[PDB]
Design a protein around this ligand. Structure first.
Ligand code: CLA
Ligand code: CLA
Ligand code: CLA
Ligand code: CLA
Ligand code: CLA
Ligand code: CLA
Ligand code: CLA
Ligand code: CLA
Ligand SMILES: CC1=C(/C=C/C(C)=C/C=C/C(C)=C/C=C/C=C(C)/C=C/C=C(C)/C=C/C2=C(C)CCCC2(C)C)C(C)(C)CCC1
Ligand SMILES: CC1=C(C/C=C(/C)CCC[C@H](C)CCC[C@H](C)CCCC(C)C)C(=O)c2ccccc2C1=O
Ligand code: SF4
Ligand code: SF4
Lengths: 65, 31, 728, 37, 39, 74, 81
């Protein structure tokens, strides 16, 4: 479920300090609760990817219910 | 079951990595 | 606007004045493109390169569309459609006049012409091509796109030409190309495949009325027939919305082997292949830093990798990769060459088109063609590397770098290299002639095959073995081995082999070793010219004087042939040898123990009969048991309707000897003969005003080597073309 | 204008022109009466 | 015996005898070295 | 591990005497991250490999990725 | 080493003296033409056989020649080893 996606996303983005390149947190900002936006779209999309890997790891059986 | 020339193999993994690694770790301390 | 062409020498100030002697003609065809030799500016250079690229693409489109058009109106495709076995494709029908009338290549169904060998119909057995009118439209589209992008080049040079910072964004370059070009094109082609290709492939199993088979418009929004097969392909069930992909086991599968109903592999694997590649290097090509303040600062990566033996690592390399052009040229050429030859070395064990292993004519033609191009251009890559060395460098930005660290200890490198080459060279060839002598000396027990003194390449055998049983454990979700030359069952169709496991006995050893030998000496020559390009132990003015010059006088004895492109001359001779014996080996093995006919028992009766274990060990056998077969028909292969093409093999020898004439001789002799003929002509008042002058020695060397190569390659292609015609 | 020949008369293009003219010349006599020996 | 080769037949003596021999020989000549170098 | 021992002999890899005197980091790292996590890993090897082999089921280095410790698992 | 040969056609442009990398030439005082100083070879022993010099001589039938002898040595052969 998308929950885990946003969880790992913000875990990688906002609850911590990434050294991500030039550390830019405001290429272009947005608002959900208190974000630093401009790269969050890419972070979210790889979040999609890691969730995809998790779920087809879970493929056999798991949290579907 | 048991093994073959693969034991010559497992011998071959030695005498380069562990051998001269231990050799250097020995000779570091100036005989 | 036409007042401008007939003003020759428009790009050079020297040869623009007038043609004093014939020399003025020659240089006209020599400096027409190196416009780096015209100014110091760069934007002009880049614009010229863009326009030239557009022109090359235009001629590409032109020739491909024209070849199509010939395939539509003068090729027996749509008759060969229903039967790809009992009919041999053809094109280029012969014009009925004196001289070319008996050459009617009749391939059944009365269709005369020329029995071609380029396997485009094979693509046209996968693209599912029914009627030639759609193909007519295809050619029209190709040619109009050609003209279109040519007009685009004209515009982008004469009206709106790009600026200079538009050059060196290699980051966006890689991103755009890697992702957008490759991934989008590949996924689009895969989408075309699944929609049309495999449907008509299904429909090519039992004679399902090809033209009667519906058109793609009958499947754009008509999902009913698309729901006939692949129940999950109702619409798609669109379970990707639900992240579930188990339904799609219908078409998007993984078989990995030969499909004995198509003459090629299972196309579904290729489709899923293309999908995976597409997304894989899409997410790859999304790497580098660009306009959003996120990414690798790539000029700092190479700064980091240094250490004790490194010196200072890869510091200072981008000035070379962007300020200069010949660098990029050379490296990309080398890489393309290698890639091409592995392609050649690749697609004879995994045929990716329908009716490939069952068609024993197009295979080696494609193989040898690509293989020749590979080397023939990697040497050019090395040449442009050398031309970079002489044209572009810097004493300042090249302190102790991994580059400079070799140019300081070149002598040890090249000495040890020479050592290796000598070793391998005689260690192989003298061994060979030793066995030759022994066989000629009634001492057969001193031979070296299995029936005599032993040597066995266990490494190849063991790697092939560990490849044989790969699926299940290493490849659980995989059905058959990747190929069948390593291991598996002998896959075939009809009385005609498709692929059997290949055997490596004793003869493989020295063959591979002499391959390595010649590659070593080739590298030796080329790298030697590379390092000893600017300064030799005797000539400290090379780069101070150029890289295209004949000699430096009879000082120190002789010094002729001390430039670099003569090094690449010798190198191209050697690579000729390499690739020639390579294609010899490949053809002989894959006609000796891989190809032939088959019986109902799967009994492979090969063409020759396994001649390597018998004669491919001594020299006299190598001429006997190869060219006896490779010519015994070409002598008489002329003299009837589908034979009249008296081949220019008889003709190529002449150009070969005429070639070698240019090499052995100087020029002053020809100059004096010229002066005598001039005396005579002047006596009869016919003296040509433009005074003829003999060729320059470098010019003569060039024409000699050109004619040499031409004659040799013409000879050999004639050889095996007629040889395959004798069996295909 | 008619200046094109000023820039079409180069020799080489004129070579092939004359040679092809002579070639089709040789053809037509070999095309019309190749039956006189 | 088993699936291995002869090796356990003759690889003990050199380790048993000759390697100790060179060991002690080198050692003895080491314990008499001159100054100030020594190997 | 031998090579690791060798590396710290090189000059740029010489730890500090204060780096030796500071105890509490070594304390925590050992009494938590030396065996606590290590006994956790041993427990994982137990429920993933040891108990199955006790119960007769073979779980190699590849089948462990797809099969479960418990049907009520997770 | 080898022998050098001088003539009268030396105009005196002195392109040869700037071309020989072997220091075997000098313009000794002359009187005949506007040259007043004609080239000559004082230090033949370092001759190399490159003969880049007469290629720098513009005079019709270039004024200098080199008679390439037979008494070669390590100097005339030019070896660093
Ligand atoms: C460009 C298209 C696109 C966009 C904008 C998104 C964006 C999003 N998806 Mg999503 N998704 C996509 C394509 C996309 N996905 C595709 C192609 C699939 C199918 C493979 C899914 C399947 C999917 C699921 C199953 C879920 C999301 C969920 C979410 C949201 C998670 C909450 C968050 O991080 O904010 C997020 C807005 C959430 C959730 O539960 N997505
Ligand atoms: C944490 C849960 C989890 C689990 C149980 C698995 C389990 C598995 N993954 Mg997987 N994977 C995961 C997370 C997980 N993955 C994540 C987070 C990613 C990155 C998004 C991937 C990316 C990935 C790839 C790219 C591949 C696997 C493959 C596999 C299979 C291993 C077969 C092999 O050796 O090859 C196995 C079923 C491989 C396979 O065989 O799949 C068919 C394979 O190709 N996985
Ligand atoms: C790609 C380059 C290329 C090459 C090498 C050729 C070569 C050839 N074409 Mg050709 N052709 C091309 C492109 C090309 N074509 C394109 C793009 C078209 C579409 C406009 C055609 C349309 C075409 C026709 C319609 C015919 C040829 C014919 C020929 C042959 C004789 C040429 C002749 O007398 O003129 C053409 C002469 C007449 C049309 C009369 C010759 C083998 C002739 C031939 O022998 O048939 C194959 C012929 O009838 N071509
Ligand atoms: C020397 C006299 C002569 C002449 C004028 C021709 C003329 C021709 N030959 Mg030809 N031919 C000749 C001798 C000659 N042949 C001989 C001695 C042989 C070997 C036996 C051949 C083998 C041959 C083949 C195999 C083919 C031709 C073709 C052609 C036609 C297009 C090629 C062309 O003219 O150049 C190119 C001109 C244009 C492209 C325009 C043309 C009618 C081709 C043909 O009939 O289809 C086009 C073709 O495929 N010829
Ligand atoms: C008049 C001489 C002549 C001409 C103009 C062509 C022209 C052509 N031949 Mg061809 N051919 C010729 C003589 C000629 N051939 C002879 C004497 C033989 C031996 C009998 C062949 C055997 C042959 C085969 C086996 C094949 C061709 C193919 C081709 C086409 C590929 C284009 C190409 O090579 O571009 C470069 C231009 C030149 C080399 C000129 C082209 C239309 C190929 C084809 O149709 O591909 C679809 C193909 O497979 N030809
Ligand atoms: C995703 C976007 C995209 C795509 C698909 C391309 C595609 C291409 N670029 Mg390109 N380019 C792009 C973005 C893109 N560019 C950007 C953003 C820049 C600015 C940095 C450039 C700057 C650039 C230069 C400077 C050059 C190209 C060239 C080319 C062509 C290479 C030859 C080739 O692929 O043969 C395809 C062959 C067949 C299809 C047959 C190719 C058509 C080269 C060119 O001139 O084209 C020939 C070239 O020199 N590109
Ligand atoms: C895409 C491939 C490619 C490109 C763009 C070039 C481009 C160039 N090459 Mg080149 N070359 C190539 C492949 C290529 N080469 C290969 C594959 C080889 C090996 C066979 C060579 C071998 C080669 C040599 C030996 C020389 C060049 C030279 C040149 C330059 C002058 C060419 C000219 O005006 O011709 C005019 C002459 C004719 C058309 C004849 C030009 C920059 C010349 C050079 O150094 O100029 C700077 C030169 O001496 N090339
Ligand atoms: C009869 C043909 C023939 C033979 C036997 C050789 C033999 C040799 N050539 Mg060679 N060569 C030949 C023709 C031949 N060449 C021709 C025709 C060319 C011009 C294309 C060259 C150009 C050439 C170059 C440029 C180089 C050689 C080198 C070598 C040596 C490789 C070392 C070796 O294996 O020793 C063979 C020993 C026995 C056969 C006994 C060897 C002496 C290379 C060398 O010095 O290697 C050390 C080297 O740099 N040769
Ligand atoms: C090798 C070779 C060849 C071939 C080539 C090829 C085959 C190529 C390919 C190419 C390709 C295959 C290409 C393709 C491309 C494509 C692309 C590049 C795509 C893109 C896309 C996009 C861009 C999209 C867009 C869109 C749309 C459409 C809709 C809306 C949305 C959007 C906007 C997204 C030849 C013969 C010549 C020569 C010899 C060699
Ligand atoms: C033949 C030859 C010459 C002779 C020099 C020349 C320039 C001969 C060239 C003659 C002309 C240019 C050839 C023309 C080819 C055409 C087929 C002729 C057609 C002319 C009519 C159709 C108009 C050299 O100068 C030379 C120098 C160094 C090594 C080898 C050689 C060498 O082999
Ligand atoms: S030989 Fe030539 S360079 Fe020397 S003085 Fe005479 S003209 Fe000048
Ligand atoms: S070869 Fe010529 S330039 Fe060199 S030393 Fe002799 S005369 Fe002078």
């Amino acid at each position: 479920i998308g929950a885990s996606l946003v969880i790992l996303f913000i875990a990688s983005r906002t609850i911590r300090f990434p050294q991500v390149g030039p550390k830019m947190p405001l290429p272009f900002p947005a608002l959900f609760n208190n974000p630093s936006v401009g790269t969050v779209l890419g972070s979210v999309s790889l979040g999609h990817i890691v969730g995809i890997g998790i779920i087809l790891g879970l493929n056999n059986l798991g949290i579907l219910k | 079951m048991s093994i073959s020339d693969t034991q010559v193999f497992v011998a071959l993994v030695i005498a380069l990595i562990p051998g001269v690694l231990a050799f250097r770790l020995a000779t570091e301390l100036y005989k | 606007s036409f007042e401008k062409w007939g003003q020759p020498g428009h790009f050079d100030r020297t040869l623009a004045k007038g043609p004093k002697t014939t020399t003025w003609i020659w240089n006209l065809h020599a400096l027409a493109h190196d416009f780096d030799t015209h100014t110091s500016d760069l934007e002009d250079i880049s614009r010229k390169i863009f326009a030239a690229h557009f022109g090359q693409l235009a001629v590409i489109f032109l020739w491909l569309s024209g070849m199509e058009f010939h395939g539509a109106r003068f090729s027996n495709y749509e008759a060969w459609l229903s039967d790809p076995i009992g009919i041999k494709p053809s094109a280029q029908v012969v014009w009925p006049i004196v001289g070319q009338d008996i050459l009617n290549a009749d391939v059944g169904g009365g269709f005369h012409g020329i029995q071609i060998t380029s396997g485009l119909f094979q693509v046209w057995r996968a693209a599912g091509f029914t009627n030639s009118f759609q193909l007519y439209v295809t050619a029209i589209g190709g040619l109009v796109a050609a003209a279109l992008m040519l007009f685009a080049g004209w515009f982008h040079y004469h009206k709106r030409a790009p600026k200079l910072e538009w050059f060196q964004n290699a980051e966006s370059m890689l991103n755009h190309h890697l992702a957008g070009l490759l991934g989008l094109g590949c996924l689009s082609w895969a989408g075309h495949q699944i929609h049309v290709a495999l449907p008509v492939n299904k429909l090519l199993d039992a004679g399902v009325a090809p033209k009667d088979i519906p058109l793609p418009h009958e499947f754009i929004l008509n999902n009913s027939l698309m729901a006939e097969l692949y129940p999950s392909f109702a619409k798609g069930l669109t379970p990707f919305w639900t992240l579930n992909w188990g339904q799609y086991a219908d078409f998007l599968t993984f078989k990995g082997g030969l499909n004995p109903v198509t003459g090629g592999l299972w196309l579904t694997d290729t489709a899923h292949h293309h999908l995976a590649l597409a997304v894989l290097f899409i997410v790859a090509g999304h790497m580098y830093r660009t306009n959003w303040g996120i990414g690798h600062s790539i000029k700092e990566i190479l700064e980091n990798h240094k250490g004790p033996f490194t010196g200072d690592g890869h510091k200072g390399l981008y000035e070379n990769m962007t300020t200069s052009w010949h660098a990029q040229l050379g490296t990309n050429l080398a890489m393309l060459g290698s890639l091409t030859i592995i392609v050649a070395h690749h697609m004879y064990a995994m045929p990716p088109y329908p009716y490939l292993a069952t068609d024993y004519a197009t295979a080696l033609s494609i193989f040898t063609h690509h293989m020749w191009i590979g080397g023939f251009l990697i040497v050019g890559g090395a040449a442009h590397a050398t031309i970079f060395m002489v044209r572009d460098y810097d004493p300042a930005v090249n302190q102790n770098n991994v580059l400079d660290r070799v140019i300081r200890h070149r002598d040890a490198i090249i000495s040890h290299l020479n050592w290796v080459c000598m070793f391998l060279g005689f260690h192989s060839f003298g061994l060979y002639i030793h066995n030759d002598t022994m066989q000629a000396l009634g001492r057969p027990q001193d031979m070296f095959s299995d029936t005599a003194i032993q040597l066995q390449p266990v490494f190849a055998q063991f790697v092939q073995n560990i490849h044989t049983l790969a699926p299940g454990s290493t490849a659980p979700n995989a059905l058959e081995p990747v190929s069948y030359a390593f291991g598996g069952g002998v896959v075939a169709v009809g009385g005609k082999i498709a692929m059997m496991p290949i055997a490596l006995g004793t003869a493989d050893f020295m063959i591979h070793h002499i391959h390595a030998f010649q590659i070593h000496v080739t590298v030796l020559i080329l790298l030697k010219g590379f390092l000893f390009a600017r300064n030799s132990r005797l000539i400290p003015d090379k780069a101070n004087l150029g890289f295209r010059f004949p000699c430096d006088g009879p000082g120190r004895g002789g010094t002729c042939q001390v430039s670099g492109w003569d090094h690449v001359f010798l190198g191209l001779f050697w690579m000729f040898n390499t690739i020639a014996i390579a294609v010899y080996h490949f053809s002989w093995k894959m006609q000796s123990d891989v190809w032939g006919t088959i019986d109902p028992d799967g009994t492979i009766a090969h063409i020759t009969g396994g001649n390597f274990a018998m004669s491919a060990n001594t020299i006299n056998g190598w001429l006997r048991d190869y060219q006896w077969a490779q010519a015994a028909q070409v002598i008489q292969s002329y003299g009837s309707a589908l034979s009249a093409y008296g081949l220019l093999f008889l003709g190529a020898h002449f150009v070969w000897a005429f070639s070698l004439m240019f090499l052995f001789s100087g020029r002053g002799y020809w100059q004096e003969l010229i002066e005598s003929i001039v005396w005579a002509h002047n006596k009869l008042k016919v003296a040509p005003t433009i005074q003829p002058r003999a060729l320059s020695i470098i010019q003569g060397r060039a024409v000699g080597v050109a004619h040499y190569l031409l004659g040799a390659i013409v000879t050999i292609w004639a050889f095996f073309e007629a040889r395959i015609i004798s069996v295909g | 204008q008619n200046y094109l020949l000023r820039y079409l008369s180069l020799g080489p293009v004129l070579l092939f022109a004359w040679l092809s003219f002579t070639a089709v010349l040789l053809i037509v006599f070999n095309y019309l009466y190749p039956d006189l020996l | 015996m088993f699936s291995a080769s002869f090796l356990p037949s003759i690889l003990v003596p050199l380790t048993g005898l000759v390697f100790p021999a060179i060991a002690m020989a080198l050692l003895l000549i080491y314990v008499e070295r001159e100054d100030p170098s020594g190997i | 591990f031998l090579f690791a021992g060798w590396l710290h002999l090189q000059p740029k890899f010489r730890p500090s005497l204060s780096w030796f005197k500071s105890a509490e980091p070594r304390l925590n790292h050992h009494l938590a991250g030396l065996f606590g996590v290590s006994s956790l890993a041993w427990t994982g090897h137990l429920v993933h490999v040891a108990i199955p082999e006790s119960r007769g089921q073979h779980v190699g280095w590849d089948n462990f990725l797809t099969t479960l410790p418990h049907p009520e698992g997770l | 080493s080898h022998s050098v040969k001088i003539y009268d056609t030396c105009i005196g442009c002195t392109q040869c003296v700037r071309a020989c990398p072997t220091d075997v030439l000098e313009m000794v005082p002359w009187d005949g033409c506007k040259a007043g100083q004609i080239a000559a070879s004082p230090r033949t022993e370092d001759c190399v056989g490159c003969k880049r010099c007469e290629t720098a001589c513009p005079t019709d039938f270039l004024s200098i020649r080199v008679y390439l002898s037979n008494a070669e040595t390590t100097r005339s052969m030019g070896l660093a080893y």
